[PDB]
Amino acid sequence: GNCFSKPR
């Protein structure tokens, strides 16, 4: 599946 990223 995809992965949910957010700004470091």
Place this chain on the structure above:
Amino acid sequence: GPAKTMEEASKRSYQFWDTQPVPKLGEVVNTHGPVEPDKDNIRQEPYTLPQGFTWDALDLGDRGVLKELYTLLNENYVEDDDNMFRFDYSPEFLLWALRPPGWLPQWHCGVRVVSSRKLVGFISAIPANIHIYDTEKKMVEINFLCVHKKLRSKRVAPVLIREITRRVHLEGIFQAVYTAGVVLPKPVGTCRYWHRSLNPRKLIEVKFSHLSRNMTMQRTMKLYRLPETPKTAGLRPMETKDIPVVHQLLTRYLKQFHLTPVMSQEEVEHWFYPQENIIDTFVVENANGEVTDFLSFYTLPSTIMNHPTHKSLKAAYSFYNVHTQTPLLDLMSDALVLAKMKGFDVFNALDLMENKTFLEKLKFGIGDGNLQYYLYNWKCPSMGAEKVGLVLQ
């Protein structure tokens, strides 16, 4: 427990993946080819599920079945590291991702509770021709592996993987490609997500992004402001007449990467023809009437969990961007403007293909999520992100 880092991955044993035809996490891969030969006979019986659960192929043409799948994913699919956001794939998006040309109903592999018929598990495969270094192979792409929260840590996911493998083997296919936010044996490439704020006040309010201590909200607004309309001459939405040239441009552009899709003209139509709130494609038609570039991005919103006011985040995801006459930087700048125009809160892109040439310049910030790329039953050397030329959903 899952491993998001290679450090935490090195200290883990993989009871399931050790049984599978993938390389071990430790080894360096020196060869090219299948891990094991194609199977001459395939198990005819579906794998056994824990008592009280049953397999059920999902006909996504049935609106109510599609809505059950929407709900399973909306409540149980992928979340960020801090359990603040969850993917919210729309029903129409799921139809796009799960019914490309060649899709098979048995490859929409559901798990249901026998008594209540509640959908509690899912995995999918779609066919795809994959170019990996010097080899072109018919493969499947695996996506949407999901186990209901009440059902986790009961080794249901290994059963889902084996059952879809079985159903794919029955069609004579023995390799697959897939991504994951966790480290598994063994990534062929590791990509990093980057994020370009479009509505930075909302992003900061919902804690998707954080205001730096050395920056005010007012400076953050100015830093991310964009023009009102794109700058590229002749940019316009893709139309039916552009399908052949978009196919041609994409095919030629992808040859420079080492992991890419090989799309028929019908697959180009499926993946790029614009569908509102699913997939946007814009072409550059020049002064001679010739299409020389295109940009595309898909729509993937997310649920903001446990928040009283803001309930959803609208995200655009960079898909494929092909430049032959327009600089890639101008192309992506116009993509940002178009996404902002369409109401998106953030524009996401990976560091694959040539994306590193524009990420810092267009004010993307690096994300906390890696996307690992994997191949099943194919040994080959790993590659840098810039040679990965494959985007899934």
